[PDB]
Design a protein around this ligand. Structure first.
Ligand code: FAD
Ligand code: FAD
Lengths: 520, 530
């Protein structure tokens, strides 16, 4: 393998592009649009084949918990990021790794067909007329938050509903919805952001759910980003090992510290599930202010109103917003290639079509982890480039089919059977999976004997992307360094005004048990 | 006394108006503007002689912690309120007590002058031509968040600063300031609300302070409003009695639960002070997002930039906003009457000019308590109507002057010497002061041999306005009731989605864990005779 194709200059495109030149492959990037970023490049209109965002989106993951393993975000960056500002990182990245030269913009990939397999033929239209070409391998990075899902079938009377309705996709700005009566269906992270945003200047906003999530702020312990508090090796273990109830018993408590979810009305049904909680710093407040009313699932619609699953009714609702998420297709692909059946994607680790005989194509970024996607797709590409070169090997088709089932089977009893969780996956565990396959997973215990400082920090502290550039192939020296100095780059954009100026309670109770244990 | 004048149809006007008809006085209300509410009536332009608000203001006190003692907010109201919605309560109130008939709108009070004292002569212009009249007593309710303070003298180079600047007062909407570099001066509750609002669609927002407050969310324990968790008789006592540090040591911890204030950069200088913390549910987040940068005090301005007290500089700042608060005047009053000198208002309990020989005039609402103003001005008016009638008596001038000093002296060592705290006052303590004067303050000790349920609830639970309509004059039956059922009226607008599930096995955590540890101490304490 040498000549590699990457579909889209997404985040996933941009990192694979880079992970290629690192394994010395020579890649070609095809971008439908005129620029990089994919979803995170905000545009005012909703252009086809690209994922839209509303203008005000902020990331739900820390910069030091979601940068590429060898490229910390500038120290002067905020810890959570406007879409504006994330883009900037991406641009800074593609400048610093000269990845822009491999990109062909406004060239959309129409078909990816197998030649007599170990290569692929790829048709791509440009200005009207459509060239073809041949590649040894191909990495798909065309995203999956593009094709809206609106299950109107399950909302009867929608046919009768006068007034306006649309899908989260189509939203961009709140202006236009001044003082209207607005029903948003579902408790997406997006639904929440939307609800909140519209709620300010709107008559009323409702927000339907049967299930109703746990809501959680990006702020955590001592105002540090939640991901660095929650995503820590040691903690992940406890979540895995402890009896599921003991864990649920703990989520319940931790989650309710902010507010009683029963009272605010979004207490879940099955707390059994480790379903992704929504990340909105604004929602609980906006509920107190009465800007938003949470509500049970819509049962039926009328021309002006909505009946609900708990018998209540909401009169004169001017606007419905279906934040009912997206589905996904690969309209340029053998329909048997990315087989998606009975609430299960048959791809070895959300990546490799198992029925292939030469392992020369993989989907990157077709995954929804519980941490940042950016370090996941980086590792996804470290694995995949090395597979392509042969440095790494897949198992048998029958082994790969056994995994796929067993994974997705656990996945189900861990996040429920909804086709909005197909791609849900525990965060660290998966990073580890990918890192093992290329032997970049640090062996913490082994790091006890040498550098017990690191050993501790890696286990008990926050699990950064940096950790994975410690051992195995492609290392970064600034990895020990990055990890040790993250606190600095966190506080740097925060502690922006300075004063200049449990101390003895800690010394005492420790010594007082050093008195307990000694006087024997 | 009978014919009473109330200057302004503020909240203060509207409650006194009511407190009058309750003591059978016949009042006349003079309203500069065309409608009630004063500050809380949002209008698009900043109309003179009335306090302006930006359009998006939300009350920073609970509905059940800030309703009038005998008029709960409707159950279907949210717990914190848009200005839009608070007005509604006020309107509902003035309808239910027929207070609207006493109001003369678009009649502004030009002078209040003493006749041969025990009455007052009051000139009021209407449409052009200005009638005079006479009243036995007069209650001033013209507010004090109207006259902007902008100490430009202390911000040198402001003369040189090109680009735009103005005062909090004149703010209304954020649209217009898209992607600009905006410096707001001070950490007002307002500054914060403004900063936050502008910050969303702005290039950058900074926010200057030397001192820098504690920031606090309206959300508290178990998502209940902060005021009902903080303003509780029992707790107030601990704050009063415990060594001031022990109390500071406690505020510091409680406050930082949300976030480390050192790290976010608004750690205060003197934590010694029980200074009012800002109430913004948005500010800490908006700092994480980097929408707002906190900064030390401005030292100097240039045409395009700002130097700062810690040597830093911020280039290309398009807009300064002075959220540097308000002062206050009474332009229709004897200059000797409301004497305001050396960081001290000489009014007996922020109310009565002591040099008066007949006690026939009082200011209501010239006070900034640490809880809701609405129950304070209600009690302010219960005291005052009764003074006017003679049912209640002031002490001597020399006694009233001794209090005033002693109060304002404590006030200083409790909130610092800044002329932005003149009117600061502990919340419950003051409610008690006013209630005592008319003997409506419940005695709990007594109230423990009868209704120990109430006795507990009153002390340990949240100190509502309702409490004060339990004893003394003007009672409400729906007072025991209101208090007992408040949890309902709180949850009613919240718990709007409901599970339906008798939780034993799946989710009833500290139900049996409480049963166990209580029985396990019923084992601890008993097993001494075995
Ligand atoms: C509201 C929201 C918030 C999120 N927040 C976070 C967060 O805080 N942290 C985090 O880690 N993740 C987050 N994510 C997830 C993740 O970052 C995004 O899904 C991510 O942008 C996906 O990037 P991608 O490159 O895989 O897809 P995209 O960015 O959509 O890339 C698709 C690219 O492919 C191009 N394309 C499509 N079809 C073709 C074709 N035939 N030929 C050529 N080009 C084509 C498009 O033009 C586009 O440039 C969030 C997602 C959402 C919806
Ligand atoms: C931003 C902000 C938020 C606040 N939030 C809260 C809160 O959440 N909870 C709380 O308890 N308190 C709060 N307060 C404190 C308090 O509610 C307000 O200060 C409120 O204005 C008090 O009303 P008032 O009647 O004293 O004064 P105002 O409402 O200012 O009364 C002025 C009225 O008198 C009239 N008037 C003035 N001069 C004359 C004249 N010469 N003749 C006739 N009429 C005249 C005016 O036209 C107007 O009708 C807040 C204050 C501010 C600034």
């Amino acid at each position: 393998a040498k000549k590699v194709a990457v579909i889209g200059a997404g985040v996933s495109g941009l990192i694979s592009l880079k992970c290629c030149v690192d394994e010395g492959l020579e890649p070609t990037c095809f971008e439908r649009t005129e620029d990089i970023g994919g979803l995170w490049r905000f545009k005012e209109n909703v252009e086809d084949g690209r994922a839209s965002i509303y203008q005000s989106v902020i990331t739900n993951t820390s910069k030091e918990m979601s940068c590429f393993s060898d490229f910390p975000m500038p120290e002067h960056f905020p810890n959570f990021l406007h879409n504006s500002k994330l883009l900037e990182y991406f641009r800074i990245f593609a400048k610093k790794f000269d990845l822009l030269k491999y990109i062909q913009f406004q060239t959309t990939v129409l078909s990816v067909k197998k030649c007599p397999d170990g290569q692929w033929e790829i048709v791509t239209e440009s200005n009207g007329k459509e060239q073809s070409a041949v590649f040894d391998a191909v990495m798909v990075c065309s995203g999956h938050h593009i094709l809206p899902h609106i299950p109107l079938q399950s909302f009867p009377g929608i046919e009768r509903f006068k007034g306006q309705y649309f899908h989260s996709r189509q939203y961009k700005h709140p202006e236009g919805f001044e003082g209207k009566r607005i029903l948003v269906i579902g408790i997406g992270n997006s639904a929440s952001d939307i609800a909140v945003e519209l709620s300010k200047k709107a008559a009323q906003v409702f927000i339907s759910t049967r299930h109703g999530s746990w809501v959680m702020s990006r702020i955590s312990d001592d105002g540090y980003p939640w991901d660095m508090v929650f995503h820590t090796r040691f903690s992940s273990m406890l979540r895995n090992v402890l009896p599921r109830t003991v864990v649920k018993w703990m989520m319940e408590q931790q989650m309710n510290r902010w507010f009683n979810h029963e009272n605010y009305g979004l207490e879940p049904q099955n707390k059994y599930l480790m379903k992704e909680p929504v990340l909105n710093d604004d929602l609980p407040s906006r509920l107190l202010y009465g800007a938003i009313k949470v509500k049970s699932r819509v049962k039926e619609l009328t021309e002006t109103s909505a009946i609900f699953e708990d018998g209540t009714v909401e009169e004169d609702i001017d606007v419905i917003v279906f934040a009912t998420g997206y589905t996904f297709s690969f309209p340029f692909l053998e329909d048997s290639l990315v087989k998606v059946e009975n609430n299960m994607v048959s791809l070895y680790k959300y990546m490799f079509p198992p029925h292939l005989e030469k392992p020369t194509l993989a989907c990157i970024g077709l995954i929804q982890p519980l941490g940042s996607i950016f370090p996941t797709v980086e590792l996804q590409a470290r694995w995949v480039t090395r597979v392509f070169k042969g440095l790494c090997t897949l198992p048998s088709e029958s082994t790969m089919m056994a995994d796929i089932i067993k994974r997705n089977e656990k996945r189900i009893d861990l996040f429920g059977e909804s086709q909005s969780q197909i791609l849900q996956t525990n965060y660290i565990d998966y990073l580890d999976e990918l890192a093992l396959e290329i032997g970049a997973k640090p062996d913490l215990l082994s790091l006890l004997l040498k550098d017990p400082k690191l050993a501790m920090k890696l286990y008990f502290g926050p699990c950064n992307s940096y950790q994975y550039r410690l051992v195995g192939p492609g290392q970064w020296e600034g990895a020990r360094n990055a990890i040790f100095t993250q606190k600095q780059r966190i506080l740097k954009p925060l502690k922006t005004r300075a004063l200049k100026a449990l101390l003895k309670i800690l010394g005492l109770l420790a010594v007082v048990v050093a008195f307990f244990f000694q006087l024997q």
